[PDB]
């Protein structure tokens, strides 16, 4: 027998042939599920334990409980009762933490340096043992929250989701407010004389028990040793015997069945949501048969049921499937978003929806169909790419709660018995008197009488007439809507090409053409059957002007448009593709399995080269668009802040209004004669990684090649005559600030960008430990300690071989009050480097050091990392291992002279440019404990982005490796 503390050893855990990580399952004493994972190659470790309690389980008068559960554990424990030990431990190890509150689970996961996984995973077991609950933390921690409430607010998404709940049973939890706020955690709590304090540390001793908790850890150490660890840790919390909440009774009854739905979003979208109560099929997963219905619901392709709308002109795009719920009930949805001719024809898009579900009903379940989705699951779970640990010990942990300990890697993807019996059961769902429709479009505003009381949703409820119901219910089959036939595009050849003998450890290049320059790599470290097929094709008529762009961008969105029918087989056959204009031409990526990649990159090309447009797809595309581009004001004001500095330091950059302005030039004859030119003279710069050959790439590059050439009539353009942007230079000790207004938020974004120099060894280095020292600090104490918003960013940017520190608010606050606070948490990080031990420093070091030493655990990963020394032109291999030696050679005093140069307020080579995008009501004016702000000189405050560069140098461009 087994440790005294351990019920059951699984050692028999599922794996991938492939997986070259040990498993061994637990089940503890206390009933904690658990499953260790063993890689002694790892360099981060990781591990993640889940609560089967959510918000669900939240107090009827306190909306938002188990969400502020989860944000005070993080804030001190018994044994380690500092606010951010936690975080500052892990951040000082090269770690990271987070964590989210779901209905059913409360999640908390983190990563860390292998070496220290003991003492990480220590401080993260007090947090179910010994929680604090500071009441200082508390009513600091509040703000966090409301901030975070206040963040979501204004999405659409989080909009929608509430609704729904608001929506249903008011009797039942799932109409319950998950997130809470300031006026749920303090305010109304202060007013019935109730203590949350009291009640977080009721919440915690009811409902975190042992027997509703599971865990995942990964370590380089043995399964024995991780054993031993996770019990020495772990076999300790309480077990409290608590039942599981179950909610077996639909929250949507009869009362909520044939409802209709206006809403009034936030941007100008018109999105159509059909909504199908249903059982919990939770118990059926290795059949799968809400899946079934949602693959062939959700079907792109020929005689599909997107496929039919599109073509009727009413819809773009559809997601079809099961939607999850909570124990006992789930949800099968149907949305689609809507064109201008749909809006006014939603009633008849519901009609063809039905139509394509009775058609199901008269067909019957598909054996073929089913198996066909069995063998593309066991094909993605075998050659399935190796994870991150800190996500893989999340969705493990959260895994355990539902499958036995064998089959926790294996049960979502694995199919085992098909059963028609329980598809028909879903099936049967699926009817017009089960139906919950909801419109979302602007033209709804101003027209509602009823409000959603946590986000502030202005929408229209009304029943569906049942003359309306009787014709969804009266609908016949169409001929339009026909079955997916066999998916060719499923991968047969896996065979693992023979590393050949010339096979370098980087990249080399193999062709270099006016016409085409080749880099290659056959993978020497993942040996799967994949490849990664990267094209930079270069144009300089792509982004000569605003109206030029957009007809790249035009060109572009019309051929995936075309393509997406032929190209959704391939998508669910473990094949993407991805394709994109950019500021020099277009970019083609093929991702997936190498087996066909040839023949659906043919295709791609093919249909380049001989680009025949239709009229109605133009100017539905076009529409779109223009719709597209309006819609970039009710995005987040820190997302704001981000764009218009990217505009700011780039030679050349068309604005969104300058976009828009150039759409209306935009006539179908006009793109006709674009294409020619964008095609009649292009470089490729291209990367192709994997299970490959180097004969097997250069004929993968010539068919690009030749078909652009026998169709296209391309001709080769030489890379010395390809003109490239360079950054703005900024001019020592200048402050520039550029004033936009977000009209949609009550919160402002800002970006605060101090410039330093050209990226090179020592200085990408000097900034990034300096990045990496500041890193937890500075949330702990702009956001944790002095509550300015939930999103506080700091590290360092990057583009055009320039570089410089950045940071990220976005708040309630004015930016001249943010701006002052990062300028005084400047000084004291300063005063911190000053002061802390030559050992906390060489911490630092070690833990950026494995930050980025941290190998790739798969192949587009590592793809991607090869990329960006290729699109930067740096082509810096190993770039990884001469940075992380430089700097091990940093002093403080290094560290301190770079502040004194480069970024402190008195500083001789101070750059920096300030992006502040003001909220709906906010001012206009650029002009107690708390640490205290310097002096800062008046900005100058830029008007014109083109004057503004026209008046300062550009950079140089960086020198290749
Ligand atoms: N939604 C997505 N679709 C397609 N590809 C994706 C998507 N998300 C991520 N990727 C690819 O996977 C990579 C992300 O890998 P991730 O950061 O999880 O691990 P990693 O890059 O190996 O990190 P490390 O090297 O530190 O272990 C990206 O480079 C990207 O190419």
């Not at 019990?231 to 309480?238: A, G, H, I």
């Not at 329980?422 to 602007?442: C, G, H």
């Not at 674009?674 to 004929?699: C, D, M, V, W, Y």
């Not at 404990?929 to 960086?958: C, D």
Request: charged fraction near 25%; glycine fraction near 4%.
């Amino acid at each position: 027998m087994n440790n005294p503390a351990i019920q059951r050893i699984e050692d028999h855990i599922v794996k991938s042939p492939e997986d070259k990580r040990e498993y061994r399952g637990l089940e503890l004493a206390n009933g904690i599920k658990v499953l260790l994972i063993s890689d002694p190659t790892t360099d981060k470790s990781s591990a993640a334990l889940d609560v089967h309690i959510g918000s669900l389980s939240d107090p009827p008068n306190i909306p938002g409980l188990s969400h502020f559960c989860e944000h005070m554990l993080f804030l001190g424990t018994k044994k380690y009762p500092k606010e951010n030990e936690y975080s500052q431990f892990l951040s000082e190890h090269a770690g990271s933490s987070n964590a989210f509150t779901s209905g059913e689970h409360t999640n908390y996961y983190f990563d860390v340096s292998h070496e220290h996984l003991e003492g990480a995973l220590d401080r993260f077991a007090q947090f179910f043992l010994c929680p604090l609950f500071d009441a200082s933390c508390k009513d600091r921690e509040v703000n966090a929250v409301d901030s975070e409430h206040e963040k979501n607010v204004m999405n659409d998404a989080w909009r929608l989701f509430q609704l729904e709940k608001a929506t249903g049973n008011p009797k039942h939890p799932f109409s319950k407010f998950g997130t809470g706020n300031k006026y749920t955690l303090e305010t109304r709590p202060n007013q019935e004389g109730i203590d949350v304090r009291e009640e977080l540390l009721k919440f915690h001793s009811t409902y975190y028990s042992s027997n509703l908790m599971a865990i995942c850890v990964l370590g380089r150490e043995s399964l024995d040793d991780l054993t031993n660890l996770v019990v020495k840790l772990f076999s300790e919390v309480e077990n409290k015997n608590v039942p599981l909440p179950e909610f077996p009774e639909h929250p949507f009854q009869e009362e909520h069945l044939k409802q209709l739905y206006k809403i009034v979003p936030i941007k100008d979208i018109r999105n159509l949501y059909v909504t199908f109560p249903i059982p919990d099929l939770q118990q059926y997963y290795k059949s799968n048969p809400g899946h079934y219905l949602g693959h062939l619901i959700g079907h792109e392709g020929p005689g599909s049921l997107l496929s039919e709308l599109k073509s009727k002109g009413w819809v773009n795009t559809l997601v079809g499937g099961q939607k999850e719920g909570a124990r006992g009930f789930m949800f099968f949805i149907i949305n689609v978003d809507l064109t201008e001719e749909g809006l006014l024809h939603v009633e008849d898009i519901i009609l063809h929806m039905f139509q394509y579900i009775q058609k199901l009903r008269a067909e019957g379940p598909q054996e073929w169909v089913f198996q066909e989705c069995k063998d593309l699951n066991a094909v993605a779970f075998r050659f399935k790419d190796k994870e991150r640990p800190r996500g893989y010990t999340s969705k493990i942990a959260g895994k355990l709660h539902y499958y036995p300990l064998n089959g926790v890697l294996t049960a979502e993807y694995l199919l085992e018995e098909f059963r028609p019996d329980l598809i028909d059961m879903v099936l049967d769902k699926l009817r017009p008197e089960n139906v919950r429709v909801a419109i979302v479009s602007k033209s709804f505003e101003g027209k509602t009488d009823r409000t959603e009381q946590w986000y502030g949703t202005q929408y229209k409820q009304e029943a569906i007439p049942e003359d309306v119901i009787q014709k969804w219910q009266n609908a016949d089959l169409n001929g339009k809507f026909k079955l997916p036939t066999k998916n060719e595009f499923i991968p047969t050849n896996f065979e693992i090409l023979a590393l050949e003998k010339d096979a370098t450890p980087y990249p080399a290049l193999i062709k270099d053409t006016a016409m085409s320059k080749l880099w290659f790599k056959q993978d020497d470290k993942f040996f799967l059957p994949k490849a990664c097929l990267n094209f930079e094709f270069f144009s300089p008529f792509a982004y000569v002007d605003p109206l030029h762009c957009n007809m790249a961008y035009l060109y572009l969105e019309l051929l995936k448009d075309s393509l997406n029918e032929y190209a959704y087989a391939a998508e669910l056959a473990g094949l993407s593709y991805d394709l994109q204009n950019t500021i020099y031409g277009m970019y083609l990526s093929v991702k997936g399995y190498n087996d066909k990649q040839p023949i659906l990159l043919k295709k791609i090309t093919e249909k380049m080269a001989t680009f025949e447009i239709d009229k109605k797809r133009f100017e539905i595309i076009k529409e779109a668009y223009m719709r597209s581009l309006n819609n970039f004001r009710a995005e987040q004001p820190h997302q704001h802040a981000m764009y218009y500095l990217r505009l700011l330091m780039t030679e050349v950059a068309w604005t969104k209004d300058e976009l828009k302005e150039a759409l209306d030039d935009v006539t179908l004859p006009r793109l006709k004669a674009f294409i020619p030119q964008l095609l009649s003279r292009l470089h490729i710069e291209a990367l192709l990684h994997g299970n490959i050959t180097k004969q097997a790439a250069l004929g993968v590059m010539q068919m690009v090649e030749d078909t652009l050439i026998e169709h296209a009539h391309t001709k080769p353009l030489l890379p010395s005559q390809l003109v490239r942007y360079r950054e703005v230079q900024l001019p020592d000790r200048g402050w520039f600030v550029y004033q936009r207004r977000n009209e949609v938020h009550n919160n402002c974004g800002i970006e605060i960008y101090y410039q330093t120099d050209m990226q090179s060894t020592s200085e990408n280095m000097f900034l990034e430990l300096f990045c990496q020292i500041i890193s937890e600090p500075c949330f702990n104490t702009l956001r944790t300690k002095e509550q300015l918003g939930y999103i506080v960013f700091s590290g360092p940017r990057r583009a055009n071989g320039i570089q410089g520190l950045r940071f990220i608010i976005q708040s309630e606050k004015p930016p001249h009050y943010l701006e002052s606070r990062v300028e005084a948490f400047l000084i004291t990080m300063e005063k911190a480097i000053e002061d802390m031990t030559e050992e906390a420093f060489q911490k630092h070091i070690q833990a950026l050091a494995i930050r980025r030493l941290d190998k790739p655990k798969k192949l587009s990963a590592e793809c991607a990392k090869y990329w960006g020394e290729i699109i930067s032109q740096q082509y810096n291999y190993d770039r990884d291992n001469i940075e992380v030696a430089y700097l091990k050679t940093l002093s403080k005093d290094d560290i301190i002279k770079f502040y004194k140069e480069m970024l402190a307020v008195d500083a001789p080579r101070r750059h920096k440019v300030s992006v502040h995008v003001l909220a709906r009501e906010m001012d206009s004016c650029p002009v107690i404990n708390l640490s205290e702000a310097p002096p800062l000189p008046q900005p100058e405050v830029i008007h014109n982005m083109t004057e503004f560069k026209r008046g300062l140098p550009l950079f140089p461009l960086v020198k290749p490796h």
